Structures are given as C-alpha cells and as structure tokens.
Amino acid sequence: NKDVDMLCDTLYQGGNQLLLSDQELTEQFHKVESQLNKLNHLLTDILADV
Amino acid sequence: PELQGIVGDWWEQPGQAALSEELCQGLSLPQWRLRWVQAQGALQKLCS
Known part of the structure; x- marks a missing residue:
C-alpha cells in the first residue's frame, strides 16, 4: 500500500491530470516556443x- | 532593432546626411537634389 501510495504521488506530482513530461521542462519548452x-x-x- | 536600423539606413540615408555646404563648396548635395527635383518635375510636366 505504501509502494502504491508514493508511486501515485511521484507520478501525479500534485496534479489531478497525469504528468508524464517534466512539468517545469514542459513550460520551458512552451516559453521557448512563445519567445x-x-x-x-x-x-x-x-x-x-x- | 539593430537590423531595423540597418533597414532604415539603406532606405533613406546612404551617406546623404554626411555632407555640408563647406565641404564641396560649389553646391551642396541637397541643392543638387532640389535642382534635380525641379528639372525632373518640369520634364514630367512637359511629357504629360
């Protein structure tokens, strides 16, 4: 149960939607694209x- | 903005703003341009 719990916590990282991509890296890609x-x-x- | 300045430079100032009446005393380049505008306007009026 603990294994399931921190696996879920690591994959979600505080967001209800799944975060496969690295979130700060993703917004870095977004700001590079916008600039x-x-x-x-x-x-x-x-x-x-x- | 440097490329915008380079774009502006060629378009309107290719060494034109670097001249006076004391240098090349006979007649300065704006006076030559004004005489050209007058003569070419006369030619365009005569052609039309």
Missing part, C-alpha cells in the same frame, strides 16, 4: 519591409 514565435513575428515583419 521563438515572437522573434519569428519580428523577423517576418522585417522580411515584409525588406
């Missing part, structure tokens, strides 16, 4: 101006 999208928007604006 890359902002840089791409600036770059495409510069491409349109050029």
Whole structure:
C-alpha cells in the first residue's frame, strides 16, 4: 500500500491530470516556443519591409 | 532593432546626411537634389 501510495504521488506530482513530461521542462519548452514565435513575428515583419 | 536600423539606413540615408555646404563648396548635395527635383518635375510636366 505504501509502494502504491508514493508511486501515485511521484507520478501525479500534485496534479489531478497525469504528468508524464517534466512539468517545469514542459513550460520551458512552451516559453521557448512563445519567445521563438515572437522573434519569428519580428523577423517576418522585417522580411515584409525588406 | 539593430537590423531595423540597418533597414532604415539603406532606405533613406546612404551617406546623404554626411555632407555640408563647406565641404564641396560649389553646391551642396541637397541643392543638387532640389535642382534635380525641379528639372525632373518640369520634364514630367512637359511629357504629360
């Protein structure tokens, strides 16, 4: 029962939804993607101006 | 923003803002450009 308990606690990590991916690594991927999208928007604006 | 400045530089200032009337005393480059605008406007009016 203890084995089941900390296995569930380790896999859930405080979220009701399962967390297969590393959560802070996942939001790191998300912020990298968002900042890359902002840089791409600036770059495409510069491409349109050029 | 550095690339935006580089984009602006070529578009409107290719060494144009680096001149005066004392350097090259005869006539300065804005005066040459104004004379060109007047003459080319006269030519465009005559052509049309």
